[PDB]
Amino acid sequence: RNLGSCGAEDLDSRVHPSTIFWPTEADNINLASGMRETEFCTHIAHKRECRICGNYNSVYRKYGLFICRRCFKENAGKIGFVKLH
Amino acid sequence: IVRRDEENVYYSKYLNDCIMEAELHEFFSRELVDAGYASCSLCRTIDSICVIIQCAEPEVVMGDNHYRLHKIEYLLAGRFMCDPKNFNIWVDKIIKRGLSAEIMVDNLRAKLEEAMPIRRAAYSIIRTAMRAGAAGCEVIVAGKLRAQRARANKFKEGCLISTGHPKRIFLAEATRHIKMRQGVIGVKVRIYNPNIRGAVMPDKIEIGA
Amino acid sequence: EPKKVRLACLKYYTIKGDTAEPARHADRCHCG
Amino acid sequence: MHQKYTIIVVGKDLKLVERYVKSIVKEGRAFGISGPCRAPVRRLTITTRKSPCGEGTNTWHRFELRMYKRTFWVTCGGNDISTILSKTVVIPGIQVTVEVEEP
Amino acid sequence: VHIPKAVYKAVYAHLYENASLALKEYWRVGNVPGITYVDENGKLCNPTYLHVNCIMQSLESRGVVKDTFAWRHHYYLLTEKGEQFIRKELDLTDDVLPTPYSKPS
RNA sequence: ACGGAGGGGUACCACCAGACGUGGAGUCUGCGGCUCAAUCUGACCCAACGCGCGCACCUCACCAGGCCCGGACGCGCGGAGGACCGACAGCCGGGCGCGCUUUCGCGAUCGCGCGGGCGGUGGUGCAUGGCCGCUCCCAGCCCGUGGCGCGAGCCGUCUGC
RNA sequence: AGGUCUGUGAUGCCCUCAGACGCCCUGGGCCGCACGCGCGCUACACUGGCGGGGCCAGCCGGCGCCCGCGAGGACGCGCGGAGCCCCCGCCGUGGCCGGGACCGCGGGCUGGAACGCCCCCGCGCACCAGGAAUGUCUUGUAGGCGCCCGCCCCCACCGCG
């Protein structure tokens, strides 16, 4: 299909070149650098997940943590958060 | 008068290293159990990293020719994108192990996985603590000890305080999980030492004549 | 689920090593 | 020679941050450094449900993190590039008290 | 699954040089930023997570290395046997030793 | 433990004196029922019902349909006189060399049978740990010596203020 | 035997395990509606509604110029706080200028993609203080008024303050 092409009036209407505003959330560099490969994971979307227990529900993005709430009360003492007042 | 978006750089640069600390703590607790790992502390230097460990006997983890430890240093270089040789690790030793709950609970789990009876092990731990100097120690075991129905029994000796701000210092607690044939066996420990670091508990009055 | 075709002495393109080819539609070894 | 330098200090405990300060200022009397500017306290706050699930009365945890900041920038001409290290060594290094320097 | 030999050699060499592998628990499509190789591609290219994950799984199942999961990262370490193996593939000899044997300093 | 028994005390999750409300209309939201291919579920007095931290995709479990093995590791067999895997063109297919008609490519990274794994928002919370809620917006609980009882138990731990 | 195996490389025993409950893609649903109720929001108006003007908070916090009624947009730099309330006037007891549900053209934003959200013109449902029943409250308290964060590609009648 490397030689196919369509009417130019059907090619000026392709999408905006400015890539996409749907990149995956990567905390560090260790995640990535950026046949079935044609569609294995083309659905590019956010996947931010607890950096402890790897869960996509109830993640505190505030202050750039990305820590679930249940995976947080345990480690709060280690991190530095203290329960006073 | 000032811009709040700059100091946020420093603040976010002190939050990142705190999270770095805890992951290491979990990793150690899961690996250096044979060295009696207690805790870890980190002095982020602008030049490198210096890490001060707390083990009952560092010589084990220290390794012949310091091979194991040096292996470890390189490993943490990969994960934290830090250059190796800048991740120096210093070991430190603990003396009054009876004053620390973590070591004793690790010992207790070790004993229990041998099928050693619970009562004997717990009371050995307790007399250990009181020999090292302790005003109290409490131990617990919950799970499916014998029958399908599950019940918990607790051992102890002397007084233990469980209320106030003093519980945030003189009272050290610890826990673990044990995966045995019948199912998870849960054990937890707490030691009370009012004379640590020469700190005086309140509601305490001394008078001279 | 197409299944291969047996390989044989297709190099006999030349009677005696005349080095000819180093077929339907003219396609390159792989792409075109 | 002269560069107009700044010292930043950050910490989560009030005792060490008040102990590092005394040492550094005692050490710098000669070079001409002066006291700090205690900055507004940064309050991190998190409210979380006390339970791993929705049950019983709705009870909340209230965690927080205080961060304290002291800033000496009074070295400047009184201290040259090399002499700065003189001041960052005699002090009692504490395991957790990042101190950054920038002219 | 059709992993080229170049990836094998690159992985083994990084293993020997750092006796380690602090890998990530990832399964999508992506490239490892550390180990890199230059073959056929013509320039130092990174490899893909699937290939390396399969390789390390084989290694561990064979006893060459051992893991120590903690949060979201795999931490592998090689043993005496592994040293006595990696040495064979990379055309090494007994005398040569891994870098951490010496001082990091 | 209970008493439509007695005597002392106590609290706006009890009342007196008052205030502001709800239940009445429209609407937001959750809950049972009805419906559908599916309308995924948990929790039912206080101690379930804007609660399990914002469902166009993901989240996501459910419904109708489609690629991949990402089958680790040991034994027997086969395999480079070729193990396994991809592609131009045209149809059918929502679309993809998914599949169909030929014909080119890559090369042991293995394939088959036997053992044995990994994984699973699959079940049991009446098999469990941990964490929460409630009893409890309380004021109570136990130790050593001694004494009373065959004993279960009692005194200590108060029929006063 | 309160809840949680659907938070986890926390887990025992069963069942799934190559036409897979594994993982990935395309659509749809979780929002579907004769019906019963739980937490809330808006109102029933003169102790008021509308128009113009003046003016003060705290957790904390980003602005200029030009287009466009507005919502928003194009450029370029580091700089910054509201409602009630007070004053002057219109309305003048009429389901009326109270109330703004419902619906019909149109202009924009988000995003790969509107079913989502804003603005303009028009239309203008019940509702005249709510029965048996019932909730909370003692000083900067009740009540009234608004303002920030959580989740969040857009969205607060929700929740913590």
mmCIF file of N, CA, C and O in Angstrom, chain B residues 114-186:
data_model
loop_
_atom_site.group_PDB
_atom_site.id
_atom_site.type_symbol
_atom_site.label_atom_id
_atom_site.label_comp_id
_atom_site.label_asym_id
_atom_site.label_seq_id
_atom_site.Cartn_x
_atom_site.Cartn_y
_atom_site.Cartn_z
ATOM 1 N N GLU B 114 10.726 -21.532 60.756
ATOM 2 C CA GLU B 114 11.316 -22.831 61.044
ATOM 3 C C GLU B 114 10.309 -23.812 61.621
ATOM 4 O O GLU B 114 10.672 -24.967 61.872
ATOM 5 N N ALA B 115 9.067 -23.385 61.832
ATOM 6 C CA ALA B 115 8.026 -24.118 62.544
ATOM 7 C C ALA B 115 8.266 -24.065 64.045
ATOM 8 O O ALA B 115 7.690 -24.873 64.789
ATOM 9 N N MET B 116 9.103 -23.149 64.512
ATOM 10 C CA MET B 116 9.323 -23.005 65.941
ATOM 11 C C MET B 116 8.032 -22.547 66.618
ATOM 12 O O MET B 116 7.302 -21.717 66.062
ATOM 13 N N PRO B 117 7.713 -23.065 67.804
ATOM 14 C CA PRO B 117 6.483 -22.637 68.480
ATOM 15 C C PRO B 117 6.469 -21.143 68.755
ATOM 16 O O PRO B 117 7.507 -20.518 68.987
ATOM 17 N N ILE B 118 5.264 -20.575 68.730
ATOM 18 C CA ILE B 118 5.106 -19.126 68.813
ATOM 19 C C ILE B 118 5.433 -18.625 70.215
ATOM 20 O O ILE B 118 6.109 -17.602 70.386
ATOM 21 N N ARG B 119 4.956 -19.334 71.237
ATOM 22 C CA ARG B 119 5.133 -18.880 72.611
ATOM 23 C C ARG B 119 6.607 -18.771 72.970
ATOM 24 O O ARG B 119 7.062 -17.747 73.499
ATOM 25 N N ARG B 120 7.368 -19.829 72.700
ATOM 26 C CA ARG B 120 8.780 -19.839 73.055
ATOM 27 C C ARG B 120 9.521 -18.713 72.354
ATOM 28 O O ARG B 120 10.311 -17.990 72.972
ATOM 29 N N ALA B 121 9.262 -18.537 71.060
ATOM 30 C CA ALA B 121 9.946 -17.496 70.306
ATOM 31 C C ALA B 121 9.619 -16.118 70.856
ATOM 32 O O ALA B 121 10.518 -15.298 71.086
ATOM 33 N N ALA B 122 8.333 -15.843 71.071
ATOM 34 C CA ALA B 122 7.939 -14.526 71.548
ATOM 35 C C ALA B 122 8.562 -14.223 72.899
ATOM 36 O O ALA B 122 9.079 -13.121 73.122
ATOM 37 N N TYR B 123 8.538 -15.188 73.816
ATOM 38 C CA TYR B 123 9.095 -14.918 75.134
ATOM 39 C C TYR B 123 10.615 -14.812 75.087
ATOM 40 O O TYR B 123 11.207 -14.080 75.887
ATOM 41 N N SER B 124 11.266 -15.501 74.147
ATOM 42 C CA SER B 124 12.693 -15.282 73.954
ATOM 43 C C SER B 124 12.962 -13.853 73.516
ATOM 44 O O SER B 124 13.862 -13.187 74.041
ATOM 45 N N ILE B 125 12.176 -13.362 72.564
ATOM 46 C CA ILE B 125 12.327 -11.981 72.124
ATOM 47 C C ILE B 125 12.152 -11.038 73.301
ATOM 48 O O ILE B 125 12.880 -10.046 73.455
ATOM 49 N N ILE B 126 11.179 -11.333 74.150
ATOM 50 C CA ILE B 126 10.837 -10.418 75.228
ATOM 51 C C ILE B 126 11.933 -10.388 76.286
ATOM 52 O O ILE B 126 12.323 -9.314 76.766
ATOM 53 N N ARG B 127 12.442 -11.554 76.681
ATOM 54 C CA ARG B 127 13.523 -11.546 77.658
ATOM 55 C C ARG B 127 14.772 -10.924 77.062
ATOM 56 O O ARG B 127 15.550 -10.280 77.771
ATOM 57 N N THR B 128 14.970 -11.082 75.753
ATOM 58 C CA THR B 128 16.036 -10.342 75.094
ATOM 59 C C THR B 128 15.880 -8.849 75.319
ATOM 60 O O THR B 128 16.823 -8.171 75.743
ATOM 61 N N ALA B 129 14.690 -8.321 75.052
ATOM 62 C CA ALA B 129 14.484 -6.885 75.183
ATOM 63 C C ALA B 129 14.713 -6.420 76.609
ATOM 64 O O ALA B 129 15.385 -5.410 76.838
ATOM 65 N N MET B 130 14.153 -7.136 77.582
ATOM 66 C CA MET B 130 14.335 -6.722 78.972
ATOM 67 C C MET B 130 15.775 -6.886 79.431
ATOM 68 O O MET B 130 16.205 -6.198 80.365
ATOM 69 N N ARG B 131 16.536 -7.785 78.810
ATOM 70 C CA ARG B 131 17.943 -7.892 79.162
ATOM 71 C C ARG B 131 18.712 -6.683 78.657
ATOM 72 O O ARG B 131 19.577 -6.145 79.357
ATOM 73 N N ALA B 132 18.396 -6.235 77.444
ATOM 74 C CA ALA B 132 19.029 -5.060 76.866
ATOM 75 C C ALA B 132 18.647 -3.776 77.581
ATOM 76 O O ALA B 132 19.242 -2.730 77.305
ATOM 77 N N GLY B 133 17.664 -3.826 78.471
ATOM 78 C CA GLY B 133 17.179 -2.640 79.140
ATOM 79 C C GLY B 133 15.897 -2.148 78.512
ATOM 80 O O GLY B 133 15.922 -1.465 77.486
ATOM 81 N N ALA B 134 14.766 -2.486 79.121
ATOM 82 C CA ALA B 134 13.476 -2.087 78.588
ATOM 83 C C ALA B 134 12.458 -2.042 79.710
ATOM 84 O O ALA B 134 12.481 -2.881 80.614
ATOM 85 N N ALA B 135 11.568 -1.062 79.641
ATOM 86 C CA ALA B 135 10.477 -0.957 80.593
ATOM 87 C C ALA B 135 9.221 -1.674 80.130
ATOM 88 O O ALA B 135 8.233 -1.697 80.868
ATOM 89 N N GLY B 136 9.231 -2.250 78.937
ATOM 90 C CA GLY B 136 8.080 -2.990 78.471
ATOM 91 C C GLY B 136 8.300 -3.486 77.061
ATOM 92 O O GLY B 136 9.130 -2.964 76.311
ATOM 93 N N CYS B 137 7.539 -4.518 76.715
ATOM 94 C CA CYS B 137 7.490 -5.005 75.349
ATOM 95 C C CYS B 137 6.246 -5.850 75.147
ATOM 96 O O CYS B 137 5.921 -6.698 75.983
ATOM 97 N N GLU B 138 5.545 -5.629 74.045
ATOM 98 C CA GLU B 138 4.335 -6.363 73.721
ATOM 99 C C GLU B 138 4.470 -6.989 72.346
ATOM 100 O O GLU B 138 5.082 -6.414 71.446
ATOM 101 N N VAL B 139 3.895 -8.176 72.200
ATOM 102 C CA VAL B 139 3.985 -8.955 70.980
ATOM 103 C C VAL B 139 2.617 -9.540 70.676
ATOM 104 O O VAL B 139 1.783 -9.721 71.565
ATOM 105 N N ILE B 140 2.388 -9.840 69.400
ATOM 106 C CA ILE B 140 1.081 -10.274 68.933
ATOM 107 C C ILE B 140 1.263 -11.243 67.778
ATOM 108 O O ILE B 140 2.262 -11.204 67.059
ATOM 109 N N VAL B 141 0.279 -12.122 67.616
ATOM 110 C CA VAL B 141 0.239 -13.085 66.523
ATOM 111 C C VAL B 141 -1.212 -13.349 66.159
ATOM 112 O O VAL B 141 -1.968 -13.916 66.955
ATOM 113 N N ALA B 142 -1.611 -12.943 64.961
ATOM 114 C CA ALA B 142 -2.962 -13.157 64.469
ATOM 115 C C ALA B 142 -2.921 -13.918 63.155
ATOM 116 O O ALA B 142 -2.091 -13.633 62.287
ATOM 117 N N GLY B 143 -3.821 -14.880 63.012
ATOM 118 C CA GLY B 143 -3.882 -15.669 61.802
ATOM 119 C C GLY B 143 -4.570 -16.994 62.070
ATOM 120 O O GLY B 143 -5.302 -17.142 63.044
ATOM 121 N N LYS B 144 -4.314 -17.942 61.174
ATOM 122 C CA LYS B 144 -4.874 -19.285 61.278
ATOM 123 C C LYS B 144 -3.840 -20.211 61.916
ATOM 124 O O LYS B 144 -3.243 -21.076 61.277
ATOM 125 N N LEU B 145 -3.643 -20.009 63.218
ATOM 126 C CA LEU B 145 -2.551 -20.685 63.908
ATOM 127 C C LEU B 145 -2.743 -22.195 63.915
ATOM 128 O O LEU B 145 -1.792 -22.949 63.676
ATOM 129 N N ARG B 146 -3.964 -22.657 64.179
ATOM 130 C CA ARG B 146 -4.209 -24.080 64.378
ATOM 131 C C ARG B 146 -5.393 -24.560 63.551
ATOM 132 O O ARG B 146 -5.239 -25.421 62.678
ATOM 133 N N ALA B 147 -6.575 -24.016 63.820
ATOM 134 C CA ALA B 147 -7.801 -24.448 63.172
ATOM 135 C C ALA B 147 -8.227 -23.441 62.107
ATOM 136 O O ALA B 147 -7.639 -22.369 61.947
ATOM 137 N N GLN B 148 -9.279 -23.797 61.368
ATOM 138 C CA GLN B 148 -9.770 -22.916 60.316
ATOM 139 C C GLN B 148 -10.246 -21.592 60.895
ATOM 140 O O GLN B 148 -9.983 -20.526 60.326
ATOM 141 N N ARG B 149 -10.949 -21.636 62.022
ATOM 142 C CA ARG B 149 -11.312 -20.409 62.713
ATOM 143 C C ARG B 149 -10.050 -19.704 63.182
ATOM 144 O O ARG B 149 -9.109 -20.334 63.670
ATOM 145 N N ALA B 150 -10.028 -18.387 63.024
ATOM 146 C CA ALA B 150 -8.848 -17.584 63.295
ATOM 147 C C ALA B 150 -9.070 -16.728 64.530
ATOM 148 O O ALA B 150 -10.082 -16.028 64.633
ATOM 149 N N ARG B 151 -8.120 -16.786 65.457
ATOM 150 C CA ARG B 151 -8.132 -15.954 66.648
ATOM 151 C C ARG B 151 -6.708 -15.516 66.950
ATOM 152 O O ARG B 151 -5.744 -16.126 66.480
ATOM 153 N N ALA B 152 -6.583 -14.445 67.724
ATOM 154 C CA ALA B 152 -5.297 -13.831 68.012
ATOM 155 C C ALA B 152 -5.008 -13.851 69.504
ATOM 156 O O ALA B 152 -5.898 -13.610 70.325
ATOM 157 N N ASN B 153 -3.755 -14.135 69.843
ATOM 158 C CA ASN B 153 -3.281 -14.123 71.215
ATOM 159 C C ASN B 153 -2.049 -13.239 71.330
ATOM 160 O O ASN B 153 -1.173 -13.251 70.462
ATOM 161 N N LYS B 154 -1.991 -12.472 72.416
ATOM 162 C CA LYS B 154 -0.943 -11.491 72.634
ATOM 163 C C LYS B 154 -0.179 -11.803 73.912
ATOM 164 O O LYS B 154 -0.754 -12.238 74.911
ATOM 165 N N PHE B 155 1.127 -11.564 73.864
ATOM 166 C CA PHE B 155 2.007 -11.717 75.010
ATOM 167 C C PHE B 155 2.562 -10.358 75.405
ATOM 168 O O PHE B 155 2.563 -9.418 74.608
ATOM 169 N N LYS B 156 3.037 -10.256 76.641
ATOM 170 C CA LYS B 156 3.592 -8.996 77.108
ATOM 171 C C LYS B 156 4.247 -9.213 78.461
ATOM 172 O O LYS B 156 4.335 -10.334 78.962
ATOM 173 N N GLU B 157 4.707 -8.109 79.046
ATOM 174 C CA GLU B 157 5.342 -8.136 80.354
ATOM 175 C C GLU B 157 5.020 -6.887 81.160
ATOM 176 O O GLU B 157 4.183 -6.920 82.067
ATOM 177 N N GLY B 158 5.687 -5.780 80.831
ATOM 178 C CA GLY B 158 5.570 -4.565 81.602
ATOM 179 C C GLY B 158 4.695 -3.542 80.900
ATOM 180 O O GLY B 158 4.084 -3.814 79.865
ATOM 181 N N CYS B 159 4.651 -2.353 81.491
ATOM 182 C CA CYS B 159 3.735 -1.316 81.042
ATOM 183 C C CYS B 159 4.110 -0.802 79.658
ATOM 184 O O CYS B 159 5.285 -0.770 79.282
ATOM 185 N N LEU B 160 3.093 -0.397 78.895
ATOM 186 C CA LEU B 160 3.271 0.215 77.582
ATOM 187 C C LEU B 160 2.243 1.322 77.410
ATOM 188 O O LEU B 160 1.048 1.107 77.631
ATOM 189 N N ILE B 161 2.712 2.501 77.008
ATOM 190 C CA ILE B 161 1.830 3.643 76.836
ATOM 191 C C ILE B 161 1.385 3.740 75.385
ATOM 192 O O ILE B 161 2.171 3.513 74.456
ATOM 193 N N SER B 162 0.117 4.080 75.184
ATOM 194 C CA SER B 162 -0.499 4.083 73.868
ATOM 195 C C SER B 162 -1.399 5.307 73.717
ATOM 196 O O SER B 162 -2.546 5.226 73.292
ATOM 197 N N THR B 163 -0.883 6.477 74.069
ATOM 198 C CA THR B 163 -1.681 7.687 73.959
ATOM 199 C C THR B 163 -0.789 8.907 74.122
ATOM 200 O O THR B 163 0.156 8.901 74.915
ATOM 201 N N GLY B 164 -1.111 9.948 73.366
ATOM 202 C CA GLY B 164 -0.401 11.201 73.453
ATOM 203 C C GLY B 164 0.639 11.375 72.371
ATOM 204 O O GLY B 164 0.752 10.607 71.412
ATOM 205 N N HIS B 165 1.411 12.437 72.539
ATOM 206 C CA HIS B 165 2.562 12.735 71.702
ATOM 207 C C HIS B 165 3.745 11.859 72.099
ATOM 208 O O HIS B 165 4.548 11.484 71.238
ATOM 209 N N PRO B 166 3.892 11.508 73.380
ATOM 210 C CA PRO B 166 5.001 10.632 73.773
ATOM 211 C C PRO B 166 5.031 9.311 73.027
ATOM 212 O O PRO B 166 6.083 8.678 72.918
ATOM 213 N N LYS B 167 3.882 8.882 72.518
ATOM 214 C CA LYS B 167 3.829 7.667 71.722
ATOM 215 C C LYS B 167 4.559 7.815 70.400
ATOM 216 O O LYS B 167 4.819 6.808 69.735
ATOM 217 N N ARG B 168 4.905 9.038 70.016
ATOM 218 C CA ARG B 168 5.605 9.315 68.773
ATOM 219 C C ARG B 168 7.115 9.308 68.939
ATOM 220 O O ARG B 168 7.830 9.678 68.003
ATOM 221 N N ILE B 169 7.619 8.905 70.103
ATOM 222 C CA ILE B 169 9.054 8.901 70.352
ATOM 223 C C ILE B 169 9.451 7.664 71.150
ATOM 224 O O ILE B 169 10.132 6.777 70.627
ATOM 225 N N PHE B 170 9.033 7.585 72.413
ATOM 226 C CA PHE B 170 9.482 6.495 73.268
ATOM 227 C C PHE B 170 8.896 5.153 72.878
ATOM 228 O O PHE B 170 9.345 4.129 73.399
ATOM 229 N N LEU B 171 7.915 5.130 71.988
ATOM 230 C CA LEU B 171 7.237 3.910 71.588
ATOM 231 C C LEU B 171 7.550 3.624 70.130
ATOM 232 O O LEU B 171 7.154 4.388 69.246
ATOM 233 N N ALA B 172 8.256 2.527 69.886
ATOM 234 C CA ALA B 172 8.616 2.096 68.545
ATOM 235 C C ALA B 172 7.839 0.836 68.204
ATOM 236 O O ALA B 172 7.924 -0.161 68.926
ATOM 237 N N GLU B 173 7.097 0.879 67.103
ATOM 238 C CA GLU B 173 6.259 -0.230 66.686
ATOM 239 C C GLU B 173 6.758 -0.748 65.346
ATOM 240 O O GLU B 173 7.411 -0.029 64.587
ATOM 241 N N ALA B 174 6.455 -2.012 65.069
ATOM 242 C CA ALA B 174 6.850 -2.637 63.821
ATOM 243 C C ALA B 174 5.946 -3.829 63.562
ATOM 244 O O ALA B 174 5.324 -4.371 64.476
ATOM 245 N N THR B 175 5.882 -4.233 62.296
ATOM 246 C CA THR B 175 5.003 -5.308 61.867
ATOM 247 C C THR B 175 5.612 -6.035 60.681
ATOM 248 O O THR B 175 6.528 -5.544 60.021
ATOM 249 N N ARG B 176 5.070 -7.219 60.415
ATOM 250 C CA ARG B 176 5.424 -7.987 59.235
ATOM 251 C C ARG B 176 4.269 -8.892 58.855
ATOM 252 O O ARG B 176 3.268 -8.998 59.566
ATOM 253 N N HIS B 177 4.428 -9.542 57.710
ATOM 254 C CA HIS B 177 3.496 -10.536 57.215
ATOM 255 C C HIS B 177 4.279 -11.803 56.926
ATOM 256 O O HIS B 177 5.417 -11.736 56.454
ATOM 257 N N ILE B 178 3.679 -12.947 57.223
ATOM 258 C CA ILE B 178 4.305 -14.242 57.008
ATOM 259 C C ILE B 178 3.381 -15.073 56.137
ATOM 260 O O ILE B 178 2.200 -15.244 56.460
ATOM 261 N N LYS B 179 3.918 -15.592 55.042
ATOM 262 C CA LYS B 179 3.159 -16.405 54.100
ATOM 263 C C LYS B 179 3.483 -17.868 54.368
ATOM 264 O O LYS B 179 4.537 -18.369 53.973
ATOM 265 N N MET B 180 2.563 -18.548 55.038
ATOM 266 C CA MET B 180 2.701 -19.943 55.411
ATOM 267 C C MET B 180 1.648 -20.768 54.681
ATOM 268 O O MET B 180 0.846 -20.251 53.901
ATOM 269 N N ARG B 181 1.658 -22.073 54.948
ATOM 270 C CA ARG B 181 0.813 -22.988 54.190
ATOM 271 C C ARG B 181 -0.664 -22.674 54.379
ATOM 272 O O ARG B 181 -1.405 -22.511 53.405
ATOM 273 N N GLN B 182 -1.112 -22.593 55.630
ATOM 274 C CA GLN B 182 -2.526 -22.340 55.883
ATOM 275 C C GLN B 182 -2.940 -20.964 55.380
ATOM 276 O O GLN B 182 -4.013 -20.806 54.787
ATOM 277 N N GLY B 183 -2.101 -19.961 55.592
ATOM 278 C CA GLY B 183 -2.415 -18.622 55.143
ATOM 279 C C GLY B 183 -1.552 -17.602 55.851
ATOM 280 O O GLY B 183 -0.659 -17.935 56.634
ATOM 281 N N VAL B 184 -1.851 -16.338 55.561
ATOM 282 C CA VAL B 184 -1.044 -15.245 56.085
ATOM 283 C C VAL B 184 -1.112 -15.234 57.600
ATOM 284 O O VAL B 184 -2.194 -15.289 58.195
ATOM 285 N N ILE B 185 0.055 -15.159 58.229
ATOM 286 C CA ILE B 185 0.187 -15.026 59.674
ATOM 287 C C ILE B 185 0.750 -13.642 59.947
ATOM 288 O O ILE B 185 1.808 -13.278 59.427
ATOM 289 N N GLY B 186 0.038 -12.864 60.770
ATOM 290 C CA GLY B 186 0.391 -11.489 61.021
ATOM 291 C C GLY B 186 0.967 -11.294 62.406
ATOM 292 O O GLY B 186 0.384 -11.727 63.399
#
